Amino acid sequence: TTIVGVKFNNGVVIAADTRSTQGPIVADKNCAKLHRISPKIWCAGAGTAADTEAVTQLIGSNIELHSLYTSREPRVVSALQMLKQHLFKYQGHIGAYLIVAGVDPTGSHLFSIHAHGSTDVGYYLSLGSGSLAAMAVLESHWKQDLTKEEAIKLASDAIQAGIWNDLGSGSNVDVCVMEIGKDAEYLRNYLTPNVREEKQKSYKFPRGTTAVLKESIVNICDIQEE
Amino acid sequence: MDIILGIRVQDSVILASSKAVTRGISVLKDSDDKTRQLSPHTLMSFAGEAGDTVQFAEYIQANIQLYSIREDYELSPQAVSSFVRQELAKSIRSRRPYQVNVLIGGYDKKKNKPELYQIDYLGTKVELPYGAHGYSGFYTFSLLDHHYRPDMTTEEGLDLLKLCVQELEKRMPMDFKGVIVKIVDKDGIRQVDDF
Amino acid sequence: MDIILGIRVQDSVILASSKAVTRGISVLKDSDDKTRQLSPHTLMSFAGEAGDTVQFAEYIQANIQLYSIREDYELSPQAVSSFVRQELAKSIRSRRPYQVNVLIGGYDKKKNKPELYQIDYLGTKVELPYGAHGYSGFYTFSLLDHHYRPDMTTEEGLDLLKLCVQELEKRMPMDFKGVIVKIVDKDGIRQVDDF
Amino acid sequence: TTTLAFRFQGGIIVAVDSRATAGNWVASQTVKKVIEINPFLLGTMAGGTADCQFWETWLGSQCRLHELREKERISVAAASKILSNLVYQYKGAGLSMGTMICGYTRKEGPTIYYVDSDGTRLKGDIFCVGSGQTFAYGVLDSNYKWDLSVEDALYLGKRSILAAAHRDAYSGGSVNLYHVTEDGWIYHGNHDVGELFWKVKEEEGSFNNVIG
Amino acid sequence: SDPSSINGGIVVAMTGKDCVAIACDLRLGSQSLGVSNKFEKIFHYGHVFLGITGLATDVTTLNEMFRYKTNLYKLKEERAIEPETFTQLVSSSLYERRFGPYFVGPVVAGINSKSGKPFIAGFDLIGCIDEAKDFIVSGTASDQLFGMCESLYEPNLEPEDLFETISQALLNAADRDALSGWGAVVYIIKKDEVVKRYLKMRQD
Amino acid sequence: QFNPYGDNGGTILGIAGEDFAVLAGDTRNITDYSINSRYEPKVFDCGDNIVMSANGFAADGDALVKRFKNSVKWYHFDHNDKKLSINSAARNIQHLLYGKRFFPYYVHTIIAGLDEDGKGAVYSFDPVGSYEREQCRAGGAAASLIMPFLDNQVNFKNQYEPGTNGKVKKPLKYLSVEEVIKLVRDSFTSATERHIQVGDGLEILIVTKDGVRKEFYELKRD
Amino acid sequence: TQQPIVTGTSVISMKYDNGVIIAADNLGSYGSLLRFNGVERLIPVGDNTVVGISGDISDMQHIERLLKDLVTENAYDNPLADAEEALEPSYIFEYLATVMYQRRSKMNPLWNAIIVAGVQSNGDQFLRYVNLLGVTYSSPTLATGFGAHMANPLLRKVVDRESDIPKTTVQVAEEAIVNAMRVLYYRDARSSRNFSLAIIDKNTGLTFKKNLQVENMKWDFAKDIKGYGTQKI
Amino acid sequence: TSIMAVTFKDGVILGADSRTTTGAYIANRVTDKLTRVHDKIWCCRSGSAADTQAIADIVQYHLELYTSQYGTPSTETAASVFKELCYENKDNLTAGIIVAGYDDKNKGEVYTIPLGGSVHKLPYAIAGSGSTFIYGYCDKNFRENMSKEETVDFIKHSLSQAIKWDGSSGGVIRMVVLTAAGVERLIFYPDEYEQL
Amino acid sequence: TSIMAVTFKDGVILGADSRTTTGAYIANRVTDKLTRVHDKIWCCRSGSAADTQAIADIVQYHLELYTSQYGTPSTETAASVFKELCYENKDNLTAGIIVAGYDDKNKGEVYTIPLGGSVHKLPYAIAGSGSTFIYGYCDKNFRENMSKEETVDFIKHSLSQAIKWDGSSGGVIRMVVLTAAGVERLIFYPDEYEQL
Numbered sequence A: 001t002t003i004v005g006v007k008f009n010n011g012v013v014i015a016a017d018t019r020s021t022q023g024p025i026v027a028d029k030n031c032a033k034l035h036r037i038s039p040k041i042w043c044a045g046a047g048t049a050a051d052t053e054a055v056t057q058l059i060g061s062n063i064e065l066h067s068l069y070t071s072r073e074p075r076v077v078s079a080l081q082m083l084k085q086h087l088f089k090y091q092g093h094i095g096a097y098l099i100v101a102g103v104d105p106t107g108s109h110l111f112s113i114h115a116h117g118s119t120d121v122g123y124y125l126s127l128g129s130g131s132l133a134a135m136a137v138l139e140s141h142w143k144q145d146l147t148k149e150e151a152i153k154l155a156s157d158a159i160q161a162g163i164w165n166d167l168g169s170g171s172n173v174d175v176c177v178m179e180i181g182k183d184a185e186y187l188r189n190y191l192t193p194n195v196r197e198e199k200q201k202s203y204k205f206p207r208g209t210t211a212v213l214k215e216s217i218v219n220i221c222d223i224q225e226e
Numbered sequence B, C: 001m002d003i004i005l006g007i008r009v010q011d012s013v014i015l016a017s018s019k020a021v022t023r024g025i026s027v028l029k030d031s032d033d034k035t036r037q038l039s040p041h042t043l044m045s046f047a048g049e050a051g052d053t054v055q056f057a058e059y060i061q062a063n064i065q066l067y068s069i070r071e072d073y074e075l076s077p078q079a080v081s082s083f084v085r086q087e088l089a090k091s092i093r094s095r096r097p098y099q100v101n102v103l104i105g106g107y108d109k110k111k112n113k114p115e116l117y118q119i120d121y122l123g124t125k126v127e128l129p130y131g132a133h134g135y136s137g138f139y140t141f142s143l144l145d146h147h148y149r150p151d152m153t154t155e156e157g158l159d160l161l162k163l164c165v166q167e168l169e170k171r172m173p174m175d176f177k178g179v180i181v182k183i184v185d186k187d188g189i190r191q192v193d194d195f
Numbered sequence D: 001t002t003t004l005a006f007r008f009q010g011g012i013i014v015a016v017d018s019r020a021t022a023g024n025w026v027a028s029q030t031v032k033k034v035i036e037i038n039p040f041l042l043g044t045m046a047g048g049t050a051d052c053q054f055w056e057t058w059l060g061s062q063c064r065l066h067e068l069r070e071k072e073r074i075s076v077a078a079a080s081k082i083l084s085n086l087v088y089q090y091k092g093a094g095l096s097m098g099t100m101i102c103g104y105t106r107k108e109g110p111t112i113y114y115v116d117s118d119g120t121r122l123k124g125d126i127f128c129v130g131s132g133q134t135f136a137y138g139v140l141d142s143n144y145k146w147d148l149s150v151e152d153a154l155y156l157g158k159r160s161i162l163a164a165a166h167r168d169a170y171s172g173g174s175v176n177l178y179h180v181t182e183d184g185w186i187y188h189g190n191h192d193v194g195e196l197f198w199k200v201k202e203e204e205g206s207f208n209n210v211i212g
Numbered sequence E: 001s002d003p004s005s006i007n008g009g010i011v012v013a014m015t016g017k018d019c020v021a022i023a024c025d026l027r028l029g030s031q032s033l034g035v036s037n038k039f040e041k042i043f044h045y046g047h048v049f050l051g052i053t054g055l056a057t058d059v060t061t062l063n064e065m066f067r068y069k070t071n072l073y074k075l076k077e078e079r080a081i082e083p084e085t086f087t088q089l090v091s092s093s094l095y096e097r098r099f100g101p102y103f104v105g106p107v108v109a110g111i112n113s114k115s116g117k118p119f120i121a122g123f124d125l126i127g128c129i130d131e132a133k134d135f136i137v138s139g140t141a142s143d144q145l146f147g148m149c150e151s152l153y154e155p156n157l158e159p160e161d162l163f164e165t166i167s168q169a170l171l172n173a174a175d176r177d178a179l180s181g182w183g184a185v186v187y188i189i190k191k192d193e194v195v196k197r198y199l200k201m202r203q204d
Numbered sequence F: 001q002f003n004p005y006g007d008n009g010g011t012i013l014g015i016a017g018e019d020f021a022v023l024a025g026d027t028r029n030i031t032d033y034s035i036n037s038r039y040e041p042k043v044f045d046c047g048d049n050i051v052m053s054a055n056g057f058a059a060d061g062d063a064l065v066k067r068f069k070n071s072v073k074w075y076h077f078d079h080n081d082k083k084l085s086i087n088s089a090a091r092n093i094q095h096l097l098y099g100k101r102f103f104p105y106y107v108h109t110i111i112a113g114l115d116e117d118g119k120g121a122v123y124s125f126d127p128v129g130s131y132e133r134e135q136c137r138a139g140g141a142a143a144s145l146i147m148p149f150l151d152n153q154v155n156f157k158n159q160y161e162p163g164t165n166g167k168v169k170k171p172l173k174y175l176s177v178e179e180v181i182k183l184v185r186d187s188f189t190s191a192t193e194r195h196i197q198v199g200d201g202l203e204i205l206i207v208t209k210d211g212v213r214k215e216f217y218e219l220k221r222d
Numbered sequence G: 001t002q003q004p005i006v007t008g009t010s011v012i013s014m015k016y017d018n019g020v021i022i023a024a025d026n027l028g029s030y031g032s033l034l035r036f037n038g039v040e041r042l043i044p045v046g047d048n049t050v051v052g053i054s055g056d057i058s059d060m061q062h063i064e065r066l067l068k069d070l071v072t073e074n075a076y077d078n079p080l081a082d083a084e085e086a087l088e089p090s091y092i093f094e095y096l097a098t099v100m101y102q103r104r105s106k107m108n109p110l111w112n113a114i115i116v117a118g119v120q121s122n123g124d125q126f127l128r129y130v131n132l133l134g135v136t137y138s139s140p141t142l143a144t145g146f147g148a149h150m151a152n153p154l155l156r157k158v159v160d161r162e163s164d165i166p167k168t169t170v171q172v173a174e175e176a177i178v179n180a181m182r183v184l185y186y187r188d189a190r191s192s193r194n195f196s197l198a199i200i201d202k203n204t205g206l207t208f209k210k211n212l213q214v215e216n217m218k219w220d221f222a223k224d225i226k227g228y229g230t231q232k233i
Numbered sequence H, I: 001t002s003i004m005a006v007t008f009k010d011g012v013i014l015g016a017d018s019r020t021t022t023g024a025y026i027a028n029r030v031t032d033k034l035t036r037v038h039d040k041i042w043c044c045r046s047g048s049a050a051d052t053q054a055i056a057d058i059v060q061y062h063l064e065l066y067t068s069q070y071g072t073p074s075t076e077t078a079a080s081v082f083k084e085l086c087y088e089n090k091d092n093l094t095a096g097i098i099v100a101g102y103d104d105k106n107k108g109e110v111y112t113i114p115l116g117g118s119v120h121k122l123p124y125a126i127a128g129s130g131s132t133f134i135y136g137y138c139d140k141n142f143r144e145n146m147s148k149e150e151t152v153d154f155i156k157h158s159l160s161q162a163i164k165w166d167g168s169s170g171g172v173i174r175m176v177v178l179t180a181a182g183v184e185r186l187i188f189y190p191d192e193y194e195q196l
Ligand SMILES: *[B]([O])([O])[C]([C][C]([C])[C])[N]C(=O)[C]([C]C1=[C][C]=[C][C]=[C]1)[N]C(=O)C1=[C]N=[C][C]=N1
Pocket: A001, A002, A019, A020, A021, A022, A023, A027, A031, A033, A045, A046, A047, A048, A049, A050, A052, A128, A129, A168, E123, E124, E128
């Protein structure tokens, strides 16, 4: 997994690759690793996939109830605090490694979160097996006062470095841009540089190729009248 | 314990269970009955870790007998087997699981059909024409695969069972001291006293 | 392998050895002769780890036969047993020791006396009126301690041996498929073909 | 693996399966588990593929050298003992072998020796070896006689491997049959289990448990 | 020892044009010993189909659990559960046993009754959802199934063509797995008819 | 503790035609989650119209190929420039592998060429030297993905003739070199999609009576 | 079997149109202790080859002595030792690769990762890797240790395949190498600021640069970073 | 990690490097290890980043609740709350914390709390993996009642050496000055402290 | 153990503590760790006392035989013989040795040979368990071309701190001065160096 976060002039952008793996096998080629905690707080997750998903839904659910209770839009620091205390309590067994970004009435924010519950602040961050390839790109091209267009470019280039150089990463680049005073724009499959070429042959079989023993209609309908 | 076999024929279920009880280096008993009557038309044989086997069997027996009295009705073999499976499936994630494998032979009086269920200590249930637990199947299934027919009489089932026991007595290293054979049919449960 | 027994009576030595060979789950053979004639009046039975048993026995046989030809003379049972003990005592500190236990039954033609020697894989030798290896003694020694008299006939020795085998067949968990019995006396070695 | 061999009126029947596995992965269904040591001698293959192939091929070289030196066919006893003595030298090192050495000479008649990587060497009438050995034993023990015709003996060997192929997960693929007489062995074909099962089931009335 | 490969078995699902297919083998074993050739691994709750591979006791337990939950759902909601909603229910139910999980590989297949859209989904043993457009695989021959599906599959296959594709994917995958086979079933699912076909295959 | 073994990934595929043989392999070399090289040749022309690949631990793979090439050289020296037939090469490789039975070359070896009747031949070896002539064999990381597909599309397994419903099998008609190369390319394209250690490039060596020809194709680099 | 004691971190390298570049820092680490600060890990062999070595330093010094002896031995009874029969990069590599694999086969490895960079007699670029296992491979860019994870991704953006080599100048290649060394200094905890760099060109020969430093570093942004989440001061 | 706190005439100064490592990978090169638990009570953190963050957050909560009831807490009180958490949970924690604070009554105070959860009041303290390399230097160069400028130089020179020799330490040198005048943050970059 | 060797204007000086421990027991408090392998080539020993004595005895034998054939060996040559023994027998040895010597052509030279058996020529070297605590101090205070009196003070102050912090170091500070003038032994007692 390669996931990054990059701050810019008036907000923050996060990105991620779309490959999920079970050992050396690719389980899903177009996996969605950008999760929504709230409308303008999004996070990307590496590690155990069920954990990143579950911990995001839980905190996202509680963040929503908190927002309704307080009559205020949710804050990134609240998501961060709730995530870290939950993960700390489970002493690293909940294998969620997250980059949490978002905009709120306080401003724009970017944090990372490791599975044992430790958090970090930064202008640019990367997590996952392809984080070293991505961080190499970020350390080479990052500067202060990036524009929106420059940050999207830098973030996707950092994911590409992971896609091409890390075997744990691949397929497509997903992006989410969170700008101050605007709706967060989720760009699913922002880049698609790994479409499979046409196969040499069609493997459609002639009808009646498979040997059958029995046929029967399955009753999916309920018990009928009359 | 060791060998437990089951075969479902036309009109009955036949269970065969070894008589030996071995603690280590000695054979303490050669007439042990590894079975419990759960209801008038349902029999359960069992094998596994010592103590747990009888404790589990008698616990199941008590529960089915309780149901029978409460409802004045005998549960179907299928219903009993499902109850037993759930208890074992519950047990496998306990502090100390029941290390017990069972065969349930019953005659369903409603459907007028014999029924044989094989359940292991994990709670893995399968309905079968013939079944076994442990290494018993390894020696007997090839014979059963060849000779078995769904319309066999009880006498033909016993003859096929004798062939299975003879193969076991030839190729198994352990002396299991013969088997006690019991038949479950429409008239209930009875023991074949000469085998 | 499993059970090997020996008894020295008035005028002969009787060795009884099980017929079963078991590889793990299956009994591959039920007529295996776990013995080698070392000389016309000396017999050795053996039990231990697979391969090593026969390899050791045949190696000893070859050495005694070589001695017999070289000197045109049969070594005494005592001399043969000492040679065998030394080979095992040498073996126990080798890279890979012989995992073999033996009984040596011989009739000394010079002294006109039967002689039984028990030797384990460490090279521990003892002359005995009756002996065994493995768990065999665990059952039989109490019967032999009671019934044994040093002046028994060969027929009485065989009867006492039958009582020992019957006890083994009752209380031992493993099916050793009966025993091959051989008698060593002044006329040499012969096998009892009905036991 | 399921391999068997048995003595009878017409000589020896040798029957083996064809499956090779690496864990649960089926590596091959076309393995030659019988080795042609010469026109008279056969060896069966169980355990490690390589160990069995290598050392039974080697055995054929030693047999050839014997009969070059002694101007006479090697006995089954002598041939089996060369192999057992060889693997005994390697005992502990981790060889993995369970083999039947089968032959037919004037002095011995039809002879089978079970040879083993722990050094065991056993002469016998019937042997089954491999993960599916118990399944094959059942069919053999209940149907074996001395007075079997070459035709019936061949079928019993075929049927016993099929029994094991059905039940044992690490046995299957196809059945190779050999018949060993005094003038040499005779190959009796490769029989796909996928076709043999449905054929035997239909003709024999067996496997009523399976739907077809 | 490994709970997910004691009993063996496989499940595969595929989408086609206005249809879905889900298939499974029939084997249940105790490691090397084949025990049953009638252990079906596909179940259905209304029009939603669920295949489950892995430890057989958990396959049975989960089926009984989801029957339980979908029956209560229907009584309260006054409608049959949909594939998308059932997928979330499976995920939630598996994750609740995060640190004492069911050793299973579930596969959901079905057609949404309102939108008519074909739907398939897979899970790991603790609830992570794999929602593929093309196909889902599970079981002891999942590597083999991935290989078959990735080459044989093409989008928008008609129901009777999809049958041939999924059948050949299952059969040839199972034949390269010691713990799979002993029969096979294929469900072809359309918006208001479902056909079930038992396949003839080698019994070793 | 020092581990003398490693895993360099990769996947290879040999297919024997009626009068030709192909031995293919991807050109990616890896350790763990890193790429060492996108183009590291794995299938080699060993002379005498024999091609070879030893897939797995690359150090052992290179050592074996090197020792076999050497064995071909000395076979010529010792036996009057006689051509080493594919069956003789196969037996020779068994002894090279079994020589290290107790410290094995951690590779899956496949050789390809033509037999003495001019027909296509492929031989397959396990790490300790057991071997067998085959019509079709994949080796390495994605072998479990590729073999079932080849059972179905080369040997027509589980395929029957329409209308007969399981009674008549699909007849085993011979495949041309153009047909085999299509199946090889689709096998590696599919393996690249679902296996992380497969990608970058595909190199195919084709053997005929005319000699050894090479073909290269790009694979996905992610 | 042993364990490395005093170690050297990444060696990085790449091909360009007329030759090869290789680089490595001057640190000899003793676990987490940055013990020795003047260790040369690039060792030239003649005027056409530079061998870069990471891993155990005692084993590096042994290899250095093997290479020194190799030059001596090649000169023996060799009138063309400084011409047609001079040591080639390919000869030096194959020798080392043979030694590495032999040592691993005796279960007593030289605990190193090695990159042999050079230019052949015909002008061809030579760049190949070998390590303690005897594993060998070639690529337009090669790097050891942390360099494999961080330097390669950057260097591969310049030369992504074989056809990019003729399009890459020595200025662009050196720039990329120097940047990669800076990135490694930011991110590798066992690296140093001081490094050596060697260029082997088919026209201008061997240029060996010592006492280079990582420069143009970005640290100013650190002043704005406060706490680990909620802290404002 | 290289951290230290030094009392001087006008109060106390905390110092720290900015490196966080996962093995040999620098996971964060601009880390802030100087953390605020109260207005003029700060701490330096070493050991597990998760543990020391969890502890510091709990302490900040305790002192915030203390303040609301009893007014400004002493540095000793803050150190006691740290100790209670570190001692009672010693089996499950890996935390080495230096607590530094400024009172008007007590002036500058430094407390070190090592792994076991013991407390030690000292004129100055050093901790973290990099501290080992500067025990000699700091012992030789520390004086009581130094000026602000002298104390900044002492910490700058000390942490410079700790960074030089310890691979787990590096980046920038952060400092926080605690006096009656207020709270001042200082930062020193590699180009400055490497040439010392 | 705390050992060091320092080159200076007139040659080189070796320094060492005198403590040998078996766990926490001081088995010898007056140990001589400065050992002579040739007239003006000495070494400092750390690690196993058996191993470093065995090595030093073998080296002394090699250099004695070298001298009888080829005349006085260089310090580099002595270091090479040490290295050969430490490198080739690395699996079975635990030895950290500093080799120091005086030539007239090369003057004072110092070579350090750590655990692995590598060689490093340095202006000065420190080693032993106690050296960890003085890396900062020695790096800050060392200058090239010091006088004899300055070098004695540098070593005395350095080993004083190493002894202060390291439990495995202690006793007296022994020193051996190597110059053109000859070989001078120095000793400094606790009452002297503890008050520094
Ligand atoms: B990435 O590499 O971190 C990636 C992204 C994920 C958060 C959606 N992780 C995975 O793909 C993980 C790797 C992994 C394997 C085994 C244990 C722990 C982590 N995969 C899964 O979680 C996974 C694998 N198969 C099915 C479902 N989920």
